[PDB]
Every structure is written in C-alpha cells, then in structure tokens.
C-alpha cells in the first residue's frame, strides 16, 4: 500500500531525532568534570566469604534492611545470608534447578526467582507454618526469565527472553500490562527509587524506558555494538549506566536523551555481566568476564580500583541500599562482601 | 565463635542447613545429567518416549544408575546466551532424522546446528551422543531418491550400508577438537528397544574418562 512512504517517514524521524540529540550536545561530561579532584585509589577487602553453594552463582539481591541478602545458584536452592554474621537464615528448595535471576522484596515478606523454567516462583518467607512455600506461579511467558524486581507496591516487573516485559499482579496471577518493542532478548531491568519509571535492556543493543502505567516506551537509547547485559539507575533516577558484551559501559541521562560518558580500557576486552552504583554515585562498579570486578569513577572513568577476590566469572553484583558494602558473586560458588 | 550472643541456635540451624546442602550436593553429583537437542527437526519425541512450558526434565533409572535428562525444545530464544548455563552436563544427546536429507534442506540446518553446538567452547570437554532416528524411513527412501540431492559431492553406491556410513562419517568430520572430544554415533528406530544400552555405555565411558583424569592417567 504505502510501505515505501512508511519507511521514508521512519527514516526521516530517525534523522530528526539524531539532529535534535546532536543540537543539544554542546559539550561532553569529560570537559565539565576536568576540575573535580580524583577519587583516588579505592581499595576494599573481603570481609566475608559466604560458602555453602555447590554450583555457579548467577544472581543476588540486597534486602532493604541492609543485612539479609539472597543468592540463587544452579543447585536449585536459594540461601538467605545474614551478611553481618555469615549466617544462613533459610534454605528454599526450588522445583527447577535452572535459575537465572532472583530478587528480594523491599517489604521482606516475599522473595522471587526464575530462569529457564519460564515460571516465576514467589516464596513467602514470613508464614505461620515456618517452612517456605510458593505463593503464586506467574506463568505465561514464552521464554526464559532474565531479571525480576519487586516494586514498592508489592508488584513484580518480569524480564524474559521472549522480548516481552510484564507487570504481574501477585494476588491475581495475571499480566496487568504487556510491554513490547525490543527486537532482541531482554536481559536486565532496573526500577528507580520512586518506581515511577524504569528501563529495560535487550540484545538489540538498545535500552528502552517503560512507564509502568501508560504501557509505552517513553524513550529509547542505542549505540552499543553488542548485546546489553545489565542496567542500573543513578541514585537520582535521571540517569542509568548499562553494560554490554563489547567490554564497554556507558552512562545515559533521561533528561539528556544522549550518551554522557563511555567506560572502556585497552587492556580490557572481556564483557560485562552486572553493573551497580554506589549510594553517592561517584563510583561505578561492574563485573567483568576476566574473573575480576572493576571500580570506575562515574564522573571521570579513571578506574579507581579493581577487585580480584574471585576464581571464575563474576555473575552478579549489588551495592547495599545504604552503600555500606558491596556483594560480588561468581561461578566459583563463593560470595564476597566488600567494603 | 563461642563469644557470640545467646542466639547460638541460629548457628546450629546454619550448620544443619550446611549438612543438608552437602547431602543434596552429593546426591546431585552422584546422578548423571544429560542434555537433549534437536527438537523441531528430528524425531526427538520418539527417543524421549523410548527413554520413558519451558525446559522439560525426564527421570529414569537403568542398571542401578540414575539418569536425568533435560529437553531444551524451547529454542525460540538466543541459544548462545543461555547454552553456557549447561556447562557440566555429562554428555549431549543430539537427534537427527535421516529422512531429512531430501526434505536449503533441513539436513543442512541440522548440520549447521550441530557445528554450532559441537564447536561451542562451553562444550569443549563434553561428549556428544548422536542418534540417527527414523533409520527405516531413510532406508526405504534411499531406494527412490539418490543421496546426491543433499550431497552433490557424494560419489558411491545407493545401498543403505554405504549412504548411512558416508553420512555418519560426514557428521564426525565437523569435529575440530577430536583429540579431547569423542563422538558416539548410533542408529535409532521406533522398534529399537536397546537404545538405552547405547546411552548407558556412553555415560559409562564418560565416567571412566572422568575417573582417569581424577586419578592422573588422563
């Protein structure tokens, strides 16, 4: 019918967007930050070495209480660790041993996990029976789950490999909203502190900002040469840093709609697995496939320090809600807490 | 330590949980894990039935050995970004239908998939068990259509024992790491009740090789 006209309109929309983005690019973040003093050498020690897992560690999450953390391994069991005493709180035997993500609810009543099974497993930690049981199974996805996060309103935003992100209502077990637009497989989500907006990363080398209510992608970011692996929000929620298999992390600002600064090093060719921010946001921590975790100055990218307390891939990384300590998990079945 | 607060029952529960975790890990390690591939292009369902909405797990015990198989038929996602999660499987069962040579042909797609998984770095040391299912159908079909339709470079007789041997040799030739990786090719049919024996022999050989590495002889 008018496919040629549609494609021409799309191309000139892309041109207009590029022109608008370039018009406001008066200067880069590097020039503005030239006068800021360096963060210096950031050195941390492995205060704790949590052990008990007998398989690869893939995901972990920090509870709002700053003490309890949950880790998911391929043994099919979730262990909640008391970081202050390297003590195990509960052991949750999972129906499926192929997990890929886990999350800790801010309220602390529920813990969620999932993976290749395509089913969300919601476990109730606080119950009168003591034993941990599955509350609801949020079935409906047509692909492997990659990341799940708990909204402050006791809701789960699910990321799956079928290119769809869904907002599930726990008590009804139904998809409240369906999100589409990513041509590639979705890997990581991150919700802002206010829970108003959140961004999703996919294998199409693009990051899309989805408003949980309007059902629309407010903004889209692109430029990466390979798949996206992890995304995290700046404490403000006005910017986010995304990792990619191309061994480069970059910072994007929602109010700028353009790349701010790129993190890369000649000696680093391994890809990134997880990315997290410090409470102040000055330090950017991201795990790499080179069996080590690197600390980057979010403002200048000086590579302030590096962590090498691991023997295999660093699969999961998470900063405490208060920024007191950083947890680094790896496929070696050991979790290291840094501070 | 002994200087902790009165809540030492928490440490006792932690030790009990550690004991349970160790027992579960020992049980998991004792069991054999196998990966099944070829869904959507081969008679995988027939092999699964002989052994008898995402990954499917099948449990069966043979000759006092516990077998645990995973079906990844949900191939509607980027394989390279989740295949690595299976690093550690004892062996990989790859299913091919010999009747797909004439039906780019589907046999070429199966060959490309095998090359993709055979050469994957995550499966460098994991042996592959190859089953050529629907052998009778291919035997009947070869008498009507020459094998040259799928392999123009092929030259030889149209007899079953020749074409089957040629294709069996062709599949192995794609292995670029023959030194550290072995391929166990077998012919499978719906009426072949001894297919379990082939898998048992393959897993026994894999366990023998692992024991040889552990003892230093490999």
């Amino acid at each position, epitope marked *: 019918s008018e496919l040629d006209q549609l494609r021409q309109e799309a191309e000139q929309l892309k041109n207009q967007i590029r022109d608008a983005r370039k018009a406001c690019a008066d200067a880069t973040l590097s020039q503005i930050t030239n006068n800021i003093d360096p963060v210096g050498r950031i050195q941390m020690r492995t205060r704790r070495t949590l052990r008990g897992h007998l398989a690869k560690i893939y995901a972990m999450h920090w509870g709002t209480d700053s*003490r309890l953390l949950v880790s998911a391994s391929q043994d099919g069991k979730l262990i909640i660790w*008391d970081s202050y005493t390297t003590n195990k709180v509960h052991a949750i035997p999972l129906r499926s041993s192929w997990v890929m993500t886990c999350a800790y609810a801010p309220s602390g009543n529920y813990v969620a996990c999932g993976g290749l099974d395509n089913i969300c497993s919601i476990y109730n930690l606080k119950t*009168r*029976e003591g034993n941990v049981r599955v509350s609801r199974e949020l079935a409906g996805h047509t692909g492997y789950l990659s990341c799940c996060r708990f909204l402050d309103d006791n809701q789960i935003v699910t990321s799956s490999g079928d290119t769809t992100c869904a907002l599930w209502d726990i008590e009804t077990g139904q998809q409240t909203t369906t999100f589409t637009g990513h041509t590639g497989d979705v890997m990581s989500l991150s919700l802002a502190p206010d829970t108003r907006l959140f961004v999703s990363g996919a294998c199409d080398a693009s990051a899309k900002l989805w408003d949980v209510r309007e059902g629309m992608c407010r903004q889209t970011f692109t430029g990466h040469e390979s798949d996206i692996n992890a995304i995290c929000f700046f404490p403000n929620g006005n910017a986010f840093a995304t990792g990619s298999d191309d061994a480069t992390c970059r910072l994007f600002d929602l109010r700028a709609d353009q790349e701010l600064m790129t993190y890369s090093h000649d000696n680093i060719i391994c890809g990134i697995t997880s990315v997290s921010f410090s409470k102040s946001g000055r330090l950017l921590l991201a795990g790499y496939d080179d069996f080590n975790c690197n600390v980057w100055d979010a403002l200048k990218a000086d590579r302030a320090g590096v962590l090498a307390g691991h023997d295999n891939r660093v699969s999961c990384l998470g900063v405490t809600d208060d920024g007191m300590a950083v947890a680094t998990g790896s496929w070696d079945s050991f979790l290291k807490i840094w501070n | 330590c002994t200087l902790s607060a*009165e*809540d030492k029952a928490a440490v*006792e*529960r932690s030790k*009990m949980i550690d004991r349970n975790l160790r027992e579960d890990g020992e049980k998991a390690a004792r069991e054999v894990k196998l990966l099944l591939l070829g869904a959507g292009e081969s008679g995988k369902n027939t092999i699964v039935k002989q052994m008898k909405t995402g990954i499917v797990e099948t449990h069966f015990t043979f000759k006092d050995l516990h077998f645990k198989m995973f079906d990844v038929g949900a191939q509607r996602s980027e394989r390279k970004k989740w295949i690595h999660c299976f690093e550690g499987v004892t062996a990989i069962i790859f299913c091919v239908a010999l009747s797909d040579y004439d039906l780019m042909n589907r046999m070429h797609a199966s060959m490309k998939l095998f090359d993709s998984i055979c050469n994957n770095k995550w499966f460098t040391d994991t042996s592959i068990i190859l089953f050529l299912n629907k052998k009778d159908l291919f035997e009947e079909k070869i008498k009507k259509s020459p094998l040259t339709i799928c392999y123009p470079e092929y030259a030889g007789s149209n007899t079953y024992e020749e074409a089957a041997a040629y294709i069996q040799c062709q599949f192995e030739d794609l292995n670029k790491r023959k030194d550290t990786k072995e391929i166990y090719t077998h012919f499978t049919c719906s009426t072949d009740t001894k297919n379990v024996q082939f898998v048992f022999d393959a897993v026994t050989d894999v366990i023998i090789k692992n024991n040889l590495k552990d003892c230093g002889l490999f």
Partner: single-chain antibody
Amino acid sequence: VQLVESGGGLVQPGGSRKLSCSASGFAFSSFGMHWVRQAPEKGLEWVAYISSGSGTIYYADTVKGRFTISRDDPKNTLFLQMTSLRSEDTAMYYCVRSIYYYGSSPFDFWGQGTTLTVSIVMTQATSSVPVTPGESVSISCRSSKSLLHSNGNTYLYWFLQRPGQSPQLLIYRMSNLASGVPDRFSGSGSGTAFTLTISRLEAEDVGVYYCMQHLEYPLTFGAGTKLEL
C-alpha cells in the same frame, strides 16, 4: 498450627510419668520446643529446652536429671520422662514452639497444656493495677542485669495470659509488635528498666502480663501483674 498435650492425672510422689504432646500442620522438624511450668500460684517457670535435631538440650537446676526431654520428628511429638515426683512439681505444663534466626519471633504459640497433680531475677513493682475500658495503662519491670547485649537487642519478651487461655506473645527482642495483635501495644526500655504501654484498653486486653528474659539460660520468668477491670 495446633499443640495438644496429654498424660496428666494424679501420681504418687516418687513415681514416674511420661508426658506427651502432638502437633499437626506444624514443621516440628525445623521447630524447637520449650517446656514451662505454671504453678497454682500463677508463677510461670522454665523446665527444659530441646533444639532442632536434638542438638542441644538444657534443663533448669530445679529439674536437672529427673527430666529427660526427647522428640520424635517422624511422629511430630514431644515427650518428657518425669521421675521422682514431689509436691512442688504439681503445676500445669505448657509446650511452646521457638525458632531462632534474624527477624524471628520465638514463643509465638503456646499449647493448651496439661495438669499434673502430686498427692537473672525479674521483679514487678505493681502486683495489680485497676483499669477501665478505653484507659491508657503503663507497666514497667526491672532486671538484675543489663539485657542490652552488644548485638543491639534488648531480648525482652512480653506475654498476655487471658483467664483460662494459654499465654500469647506480644513483643520480641525490641519493642517489636508481634503478629496477629493490634497496634495499640508498644514497649520501650534502656537496658535495665523496661516498660510496656497500651494506648487504648479493650475487653480482650484483660489478663496477666508476663516478662521473661532471654540473655542467658536458665530462662527466668517474671512474677506477673494482674489487670482488673
């Protein structure tokens, strides 16, 4: 969750008895158990404790050796081997669950108990305090040692024993509201002086308030204060 005890009745002094308790819909394997006496003088006391898997067992100096606490996880039952009975042993026996981990609320359920008839110091300033519906009441108790452990927990437990009913937990380890109770209950303390307050009294808040420490064994129980309408 339900706990039922059995094995009561009259017993001659110096005899033997094997009290038993059974639970249903109860993860007995992962749950600990406590035995506490309730003498006719309304003074609660601690008898024995058995941890999960029978790993650790403790007895009070008043019941040492004579009592042998045993559990059978497959049967989900708890047993007491009682020998050398005396007159002072005449008291109601309660089975109390307990779980120990971060954020835990031990002693959250008390059994109906059974009656057996034989042929750190806690003090309460007020033996009783008259009250009326809708009135605000404040109760305080004192301890012989500072319960503020270095871990940052006051280890203060509060219970209510309504007439004819088993005690019910109110607070756990710091002013923390128990599950299933209204929000009108609150508490505070400094380490040696502890207080419990109720914003608005209701008809269901009539009974005896009990205070017990958990800093070190044996678990010593308070005398208790009775609330009169």
